[PDB]
Amino acid sequence: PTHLSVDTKFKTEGLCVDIPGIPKDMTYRRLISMMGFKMNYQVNGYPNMFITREEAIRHVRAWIGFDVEGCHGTNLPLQLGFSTGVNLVAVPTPLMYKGLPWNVVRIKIVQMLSDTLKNLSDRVVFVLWAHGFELTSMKYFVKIGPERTCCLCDRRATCFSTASDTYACWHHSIGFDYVYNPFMIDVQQWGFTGNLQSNHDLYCQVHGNAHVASCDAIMTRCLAVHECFVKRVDWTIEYPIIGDELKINAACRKVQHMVVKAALLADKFPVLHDIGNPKAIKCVPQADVEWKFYDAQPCSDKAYKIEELFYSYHSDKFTDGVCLFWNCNVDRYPANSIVCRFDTRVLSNLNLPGCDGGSLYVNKHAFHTPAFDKSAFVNLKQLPFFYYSDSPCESHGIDYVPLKSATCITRCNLGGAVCRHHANEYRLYLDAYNMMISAGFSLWVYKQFDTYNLWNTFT
Numbered sequence: 001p002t003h004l005s006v007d008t009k010f011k012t013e014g015l016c017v018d019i020p021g022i023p024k025d026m027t028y029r030r031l032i033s034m035m036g037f038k039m040n041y042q043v044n045g046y047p048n049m050f051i052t053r054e055e056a057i058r059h060v061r062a063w064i065g066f067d068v069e070g071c072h073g074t075n076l077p078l079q080l081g082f083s084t085g086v087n088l089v090a091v092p093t094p095l096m097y098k099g100l101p102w103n104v105v106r107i108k109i110v111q112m113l114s115d116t117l118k119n120l121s122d123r124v125v126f127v128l129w130a131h132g133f134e135l136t137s138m139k140y141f142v143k144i145g146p147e148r149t150c151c152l153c154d155r156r157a158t159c160f161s162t163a164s165d166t167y168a169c170w171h172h173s174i175g176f177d178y179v180y181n182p183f184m185i186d187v188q189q190w191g192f193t194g195n196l197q198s199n200h201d202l203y204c205q206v207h208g209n210a211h212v213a214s215c216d217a218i219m220t221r222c223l224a225v226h227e228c229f230v231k232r233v234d235w236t237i238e239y240p241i242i243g244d245e246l247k248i249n250a251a252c253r254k255v256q257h258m259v260v261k262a263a264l265l266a267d268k269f270p271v272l273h274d275i276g277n278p279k280a281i282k283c284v285p286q287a288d289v290e291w292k293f294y295d296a297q298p299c300s301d302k303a304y305k306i307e308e309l310f311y312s313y314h315s316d317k318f319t320d321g322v323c324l325f326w327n328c329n330v331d332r333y334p335a336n337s338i339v340c341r342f343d344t345r346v347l348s349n350l351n352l353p354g355c356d357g358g359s360l361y362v363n364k365h366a367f368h369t370p371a372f373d374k375s376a377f378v379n380l381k382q383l384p385f386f387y388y389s390d391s392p393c394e395s396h397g398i399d400y401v402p403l404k405s406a407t408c409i410t411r412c413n414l415g416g417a418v419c420r421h422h423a424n425e426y427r428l429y430l431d432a433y434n435m436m437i438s439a440g441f442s443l444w445v446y447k448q449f450d451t452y453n454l455w456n457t458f459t
């Protein structure tokens with residue numbers, strides 16, 4: 001109960017237009033053999049080219065939608081499309097490349113997958129809506145065998161080179177021509193009525209159909225993300241650390257404490273309505289305020305309607321005091337809000353393309369986030385950068401260049417010169433803030449927010 005048994009049945013109805021006469025009774029073992037791959041009864045870490053839905057969810061960073069369309073099948077050219085937007089034409093003799101033989105097409109496939117995946121995953125998972133030509137084209141660019149390590153490092157092998165007879169990971173495969181031990185999953189095996197477009201269009205209006213293979217590849221991965229991360233949610237699955245995860249999460253905690261502490265000091269709200277994570281803790285535990293929590297899990301489909309979160313009969317009066325929405329995605333924030341909203345458009349190794357404008361943000365856990373929409377912030381303004389501290393000016397225990405800044409809200413800056421301690425803390429805070437912003441988080445606040453009101457907390 002870990003891998004997909006090769007003896008599991010494979011429904012072949014979707015394959016019978018490309019492969020007429022295909023047997024209805026089919027296993028992964030017989031299908032893999034039909035594809036031209038010999039498994040030789042190998043107990044060396046690669047029991048099946050195909051994987052379970054559960055294993056595919058654990059390796060979502062490796063997902064590459066793949067489709068093959070007949071341009072004209074041994075005699076006809078094939079259009080190979082990938083969810084990266086690339087279309088390659090292979091001759092047997094939205095980027096669109098002209099027809100070239102397989103020996104050069106396979107070098108491009110390896111280069112493209114390596115650049116897309118080296119900072120995301122240790123493997124590739126081809127996400128298919130299998131009709132036949134994609135499965136039969138794999139023998140022209142895929143090699144299989146025992147699990148291996150890279151020739152230049154300790155990572156698992158993802159590529160093979162016929163020129164040198166060596167194996168490489170995604171980071172060391174320059175000049176390699178074969179994809180080695182890829183994984184794959186057929187979305188058609190999940191139980192669907194109707195074609196790819198009809199199922200995809202039920203949940204997404206952002207991916208159209210220009211009738212090229214890459215359009216189908218994108219729609220296939222999109223539908224798979226919808227099924228595994230939008231209609232079904234598993235927040236218990238852990239994902240490996242691949243970048244700045246720990247620094248981003250630490251920065252998020254620091255920024256939240258800073259902004260909320262300052263909003264309470266500047267406007268002295270008698271009550272704070274904390275809307276979001278049912279396991280949230282008070283981000284400013286020493287604040288005088290009446291802290292009230294409201295449970296809402298992360299929305300993965302569409303943003304919450306403020307009318308459903310707040311109305312239908314709690315302080316009841318959400319208009320009293322301030323509302324804190326820390327990564328709680330709503331359609332239109334109330335005017336009295338402090339907000340952190342993840343911008344789905346951000347380019348990063350943590351943020352993967354999602355469904356209907358949304359993105360899949362993977363940092364320890366996977367969170368499909370609804371599309372970022374600027375109109376949600378109409379009653380608020382962007383929160384300006386600032387650093388506030390009421391801690392004593394005392395160095396304790398890296399060198400020094402005098403800090404001059406209008407945004408260092410400290411007693412030392414009020415009285416002229418910034419002390420070394422507050423200058424060090426200001427620089428660390430600025431780095432944390434820039435880290436969080438660059439990760440894709442955006443901050444918004446009630447229009448009356450004014451850091452000028454923080455200087456009088458030093459009297």
Ligand SMILES: C[C@@H]1CN(C(=O)COC(F)F)C[C@H](C)O1
Nearest residue numbers: 103104107161162163175176177
């Ligand atoms: C396009 C060149 C030439 N090549 C072949 O044509 C041999 O391919 C054969 F061994 F599979 C190998 C090299 C990696 O790319």
Ligand SMILES: [Zn+2]
Nearest residue numbers: 150153169172
């Ligand atoms: Zn390597």
Ligand SMILES: [Zn+2]
Nearest residue numbers: 204207222356
């Ligand atoms: Zn889509």
Ligand SMILES: [Zn+2]
Nearest residue numbers: 393412419422
């Ligand atoms: Zn100071």
